[PDB]
């Protein structure tokens, strides 16, 4: 029969995605993550399997895809996605559970930038990678590995660009992602969605919000902040598009950069990246590659 899903034994319920339910599984002795969709969730399943099967997608800071499969238990067909297990889980869960070192922060920050710069960069060739925008970049969708670098999951909302024709592989809706991480252009309806660079610019904003969440947990000599989500101070816990538009577009607040980040050098680089990631004009924002370059300077420096 089939060689993946037949041979996997589910052990623990991890939790829900947007669609489909996440499990700890044993494959051939090794631990795996399994994500399971109903027969009516087939568009979501297929599209996510389509993105992970993009040629040249595999980076150390993208989640390692094993396989899409079917599994008939006897009553009903389950649609499976199988991946690498990471015991720490999400960047959200890690930053709630733990503080980090100075070296710890940059490992989390660099890897997330490297992941998105890989995802964004077109690789021309016969085995050629399309440029890929995420559309839902957040701490819940980034996983943390056992080495303490990150990898990006939740590519099911992603869009892919052919540079020759200048087309996106789907006709994209307004307002698909997590409402809290939606960029100002996405919030106020103003984003042009036959411009591909705009979707990349929308991802850099949200990585800025992820970079804030990490930098709060940086324990220099006692002193760290608590875990918070971006706009904990300014919106409710499941916030509306209306509620988010009033803070980000109308009032023009980033997340608040505290005083003691000015003392340490590594936090000021991160603080400068954050405030260069927030910008209501998307064209003002940095590339993931310029962020990757800058953090890779800081990594190969301070003694
Ligand atoms: C393509 C694929 C296959 C299997 C799992 C996941 C997946 N989807 C998500 C969310 C963010 C909820 C959409 N998380 C995972 C995930 C992946 C690996 C894990 C894990 C969860 O817990 C520890 O190890 N995606």
Residue numbers in the entry: -1 to 301
The authors write:
The TβRI–SB505124 complex closely resembles the TβRI kinase conformation observed in the TβRI–SB431542 complex. Molecular-docking studies and comparative modelling have also shown that SB505124 aligns more favourably within the ALK5 binding site compared with other ALK receptors, forming more stable interactions and supporting its structural selectivity. Clear electron density was observed for SB505124, with a heterocyclic ring structure (pyridine, pyrimidine and benzene rings) similar to SB431542 (pyridine and benzodioxole rings); both of them act as a type I kinase inhibitor by occupying the ATP-binding region and adjacent hydrophobic sites near the hinge region, which is the linker between the N- and C-terminal kinase lobes. The position of the pyridinyl ring adjacent to the gatekeeper residue is further stabilized by hydrophobic interactions with Leu260 and Leu278. Two hydrogen bonds link SB505124 with ICD: one is between the benzodioxole O atom of SB505124 and the amide N atom of His283 from the hinge region, a feature that is common to many ATP-competitive kinase inhibitors, while the second hydrogen bond is between Leu332 and the imidazole ring of SB505124, which is also stabilized by Val219 through hydrophobic interactions.
